[PDB]
A paper describes a structure:
The final step of gene expression, translation, is carried out by specialized mitochondrial ribosomes (mitoribosomes). Here, we present a biochemical and structural characterization of the mitoribosome in the model green alga Chlamydomonas reinhardtii, as well as a functional study of some of its specific components. Single particle cryo-electron microscopy resolves how the Chlamydomonas mitoribosome is assembled from 13 rRNA fragments encoded by separate non-contiguous gene pieces. In contrast to flowering plants, where rRNAs are largely expanded, the C. reinhardtii mitoribosome is characterized by its reduced and fragmented rRNAs.
The large subunit (LSU) was resolved to 2.9 Å, while the small subunit (SSU) was reconstructed at 5.49 Å and further refined to 4.19 Å for the body and 4.47 Å for the head using a focused refinement approach. Reconstruction of the LSU revealed eight additional r-proteins, named mL113 to mL119, plus PPR*, a putative PentatricoPeptide Repeat (PPR) protein. With the exception of mL119 at the exit of the peptide channel, all these proteins are relatively large RNA binders composed of repeated alpha-helical folds, including a mitochondrial TERmination Factor (mTERF) protein, several OctotricoPeptide Repeat (OPR) proteins, and PPR*. In contrast to the SSU, the nine rRNA fragments in the LSU are all stabilized by the newly identified Chlamydomonas-specific r-proteins. Fragments L7 and L8, the largest of all, make up domains IV, V, and VI, which form the catalytic core of the ribosome. Surprisingly, while it was anticipated that 5S rRNA should be absent from Chlamydomonas mitoribosome, we identified an RNA density at the typical position of the 5 S rRNA in the central protuberance (CP). This rRNA density could be attributed to the L3a rRNA fragment. Proteins mL115, mL116 and mL117 stabilize the 3′ extremities of L1, L2a, and L5, respectively, by binding the single-stranded rRNA fragments in their inner groove. The LSU reconstruction revealed the presence of a specific r-protein, mL119, precisely located at the exit of the peptide channel. Interestingly, the membrane interaction in Chlamydomonas is mediated via two contact points. mL119 forms one contact, and mL113 create a second contact point directly with the membrane, similar to ES-H96 in yeast.
Residue numbers in the entry:
A (entry chain A): 231 to 280
B (entry chain a): 69 to 311, 330 to 349
Write the structure that this text describes.
RNA sequence: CCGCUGGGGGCGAGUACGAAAGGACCAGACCCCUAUAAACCUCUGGUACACUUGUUGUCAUUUACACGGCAUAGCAAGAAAGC
RNA sequence: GUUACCCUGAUCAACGGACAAAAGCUACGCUAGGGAUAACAGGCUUAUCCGCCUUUAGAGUUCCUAUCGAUGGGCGGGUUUGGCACCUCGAUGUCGGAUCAUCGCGUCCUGUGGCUGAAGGAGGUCGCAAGGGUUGGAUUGUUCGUCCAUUAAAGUGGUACGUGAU
RNA sequence: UACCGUACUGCAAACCGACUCAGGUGGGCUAGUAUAUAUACUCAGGCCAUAGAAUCAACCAUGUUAAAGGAACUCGGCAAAAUGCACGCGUGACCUCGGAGGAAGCGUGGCUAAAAAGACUCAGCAAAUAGCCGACAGCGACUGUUUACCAAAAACACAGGAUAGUGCUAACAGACGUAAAUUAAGCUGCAAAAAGCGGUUUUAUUUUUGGAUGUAUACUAUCCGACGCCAAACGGCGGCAGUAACUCUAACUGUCCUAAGGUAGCGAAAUUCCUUGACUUGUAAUUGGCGUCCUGCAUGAAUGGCGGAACGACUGUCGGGCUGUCUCUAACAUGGAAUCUGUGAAUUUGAAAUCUUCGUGCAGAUGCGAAGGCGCUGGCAAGGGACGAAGAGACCCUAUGCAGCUUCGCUGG
């Protein structure tokens, strides 16, 4: 068994885990977003776009 | 001693070598899926509560769970002649049910599931009430049943339905008649005092062959939703400390109703 | 400066000896073997993949004549140089 | 109650007497160090070991010295078992054989000389000599050991009890 | 009859692995000989770009062949070799009657023949694909599961059995500061000029975690692990010194602390120090097996005792066949290595212009002393040394050291 390939990509799972709405659904996710804002990150979440 | 309604599997391979299964020719009318409005399709649980962690262990997997609406009170079918159409075998209970069709005068005929006593032949008519018969499958009040005749599906508080003696091939016996108490021997050799307004389905529950059945292999009991157990001494001390205590809640409100314990 | 010259059994001797059975020192040389070392392919064998013969399946083959590809050199047998 | 004086009270015995009280395991272990503390072995020693004697009382059908050594006394080696902990823990293959080696002689054979209780044979020692030879495998993880049967013989050691950057 | 997707790639040079990475990645469609999606050659279609060029190094990897032998090799036939297929015969013990079993072992095969037969070939399962077999034991009933990255097993599980708890708002396992929201019917009641607000019982809809829309033939926990034949709670089950017409066992009696001193049926056994246990066989030679015997350092009905069919990528042994494992290696094939051209790292490194022996020495010296040797520098090889390199943890000891686990260590609601 060769390791190293733990990242199996999937857009549904990526948006459903680290998206905006699961971050906003819980209070501590909202303080995660708030300290992302206080640090000054250009990308707030993995699914943000314009 | 060969019992009539068991399929004795020949020892063709290991696994079917020591396997005994119930014949569905003794119960000839089991054939057919569960009735489409008396049954639903609920998801299996796996032994996990609303939190999602395991509360009951060694459970999970198997056939899709189908639940059946069994009427354990027979309160709204009192005084109604119900002809038993067929007997059905549910995997969720040890004893098997009986489909009964009631035809009331002002309403269209409907079907209900009740537990099957020993004398149901898919042709009998069941009746429930103060004036009901003493033939098996009738629901009578505890005052109207005799002393020493076997009874099943007993209630504890009236209006709730039958909760006692309802497994396969089990029955209860009334031995005494105290005006509001009626001492009854529960199937564990325990005497309990049950109120006379409670009801008893007279007869004896079917599926006596349940004791003689033998799943010959791990898979046939695993396919019923029973995941394998692990012995306590097979672990490290963090998981279990390997490698005579009565646990009933004392000072309970039900001590007043029991004369002797489970013997 | 390196390597460095090994032995055993016969013949010598049915013997000098020795009542007698029982049998040598000499290896001095000849005959056999066996090592070790150094070569060589003359013999005997092994191998030999652009050699010769036979054959199976299949693809090509306006002849399912000959020839060609692949299947471990397809397989099997027999070979000369070289080793 | 506060303060002094006169006094008392622990096998506080871990006896200059831990903060109340008070046991283990780690072959699952983790960290920091130590060659300041051991094992695998190199260094020092030689009690135990092994060779050389000396005294040699005696045995040897007699007779100490063909041959053996009883008791004491020593000299040499560190290949036995030990003693020390001097060297490496910023971790270093030994307790095996498979291949391939080199050296010493305290020589098993081959080459040889003396004493022989020496019929030459066949032996026992003792003196010189290390050129090259010491093979089979069945059984044991055994370097220990037998016993199958052949040879002239089936040597004992230094080799970090030779040899895993083969 | 709008909006979004439509390029390209998709067993891969475009995804997941730091890479143009020998790894991992789902579904569907398909031609002939031919017969199965297996096997050999081929259709449609695709490919022969990512180092090239010759040649006889040694050596390494992977194979072919090998005279006479044949496990003699080795801890151990490990690894190779060998049987490998459809039609016929046949076909053991033991056994849960199913199996063992494809037991073992012996014939018959391509090609031509509108056909009673034949040809020649060394060879007709002709090339490729398709079990080595038998016997004695040990352990585990079986198929399965198990340490991703050194262990697939005798470990775990298993069907079954035994025990203990559980009478239902069950036990057991979890959330914890405590469960209630909206109508309806009935019985009502208060002062009162023709109506309002209440109290109580029942019912309806919700909301009320698994076990369970289950209920002592059911659920949970523990132990043994099928089936067959004769305190199933932790867990064991002693000594002293003598008594049977020749030596020697101690059967019944005599004693001491003591819960009790281990039955028919076991034993140098997974486990017995003496040890190469005496005994038979096994081999020419046996310390590792098999079957007896007794002298049980330190065995034994629930730590389950007594053996069995079938099963096992489990363990120890014997025969047949087979062959380079071996006696003892040789030739050949493919691909590295060696030569050339092109691309082009890393481990390591106080500075070096780094000889041998003996001695000395922080006790094994390239560097010190004495003596000697040596034109200089490389390629291709072998690795004895540089206490080669690779980890400031293999083992031991220490710390005001940590960590987890255990308990008749201490203290706590
Ligand atoms: Mg895989
Ligand atoms: Mg990653
Ligand atoms: Mg020639
Ligand atoms: Mg030729
Ligand atoms: Mg072609
Ligand atoms: Mg050559
Ligand atoms: Mg102290
Ligand atoms: Mg203290
Ligand atoms: Mg030492
Ligand atoms: Mg692939
Ligand atoms: Mg990688
Ligand atoms: Mg790839
Ligand atoms: Mg092809
Ligand atoms: Mg190319
Ligand atoms: Mg031959
Ligand atoms: Mg063939
Ligand atoms: Mg199978
Ligand atoms: Mg298995
Ligand atoms: Mg019970
Ligand atoms: Mg090449
Ligand atoms: Mg020196
Ligand atoms: Mg040179
Ligand atoms: Mg070189
Ligand atoms: Mg300390």
């Amino acid at each position: 068994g060769n390791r190293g390939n733990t990242y199996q990509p999937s857009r549904r799972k990526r948006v459903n885990r680290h998206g905006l709405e699961k971050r906003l659904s819980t209070p501590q996710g909202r303080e995660v977003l708030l300290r992302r804002l206080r640090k000054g990150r250009w990308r707030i979440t993995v699914d943000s776009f314009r | 001693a060969p019992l009539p309604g068991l399929i004795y599997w020949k020892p063709s391979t290991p696994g079917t070598r020591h396997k005994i299964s119930i014949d569905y020719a003794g119960l000839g009318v089991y054939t057919g899926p569960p009735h489409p409005e008396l049954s639903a399709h609920v998801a299996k649980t796996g032994g996990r509560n609303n939190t999602g962690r395991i509360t009951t262990r060694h459970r999970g997997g198997g056939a899709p769970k189908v639940v059946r609406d069994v009427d354990f009170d027979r309160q709204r079918v009192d005084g109604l002649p119900g002809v038993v159409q067929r007997l059905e075998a549910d995997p969720g209970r040890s004893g098997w049910l009986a489909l009964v069709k009631y035809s009331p005068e002002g309403q269209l005929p409907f079907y209900r599931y009740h537990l099957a006593p020993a004398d149901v032949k898919a042709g009998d008519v069941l009746m429930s009430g103060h004036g009901a018969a003493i033939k098996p499958g009738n629901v009578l009040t505890l005052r109207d049943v005799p002393i020493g005749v076997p009874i099943h599906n007993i209630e504890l508080v009236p209006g709730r339905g039958g909760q006692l003696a309802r497994a396969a091939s089990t029955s209860a016996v009334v031995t005494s008649k105290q005006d509001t108490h009626a001492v009854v021997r529960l199937p564990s050799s325990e005497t309990r005092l049950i109120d006379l307004s409670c009801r008893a389905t007279v007869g004896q529950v079917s599926n006596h062959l349940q004791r003689s059945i033998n799943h010959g292999k791990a898979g046939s009991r695993r396919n019923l939703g029973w995941r394998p157990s692990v012995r306590g001494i097979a672990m490290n001390p963090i998981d279990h400390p390997h490698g005579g205590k009565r646990t009933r809640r004392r000072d309970a409100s039900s001590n007043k109703f029991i004369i002797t314990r489970a013997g």
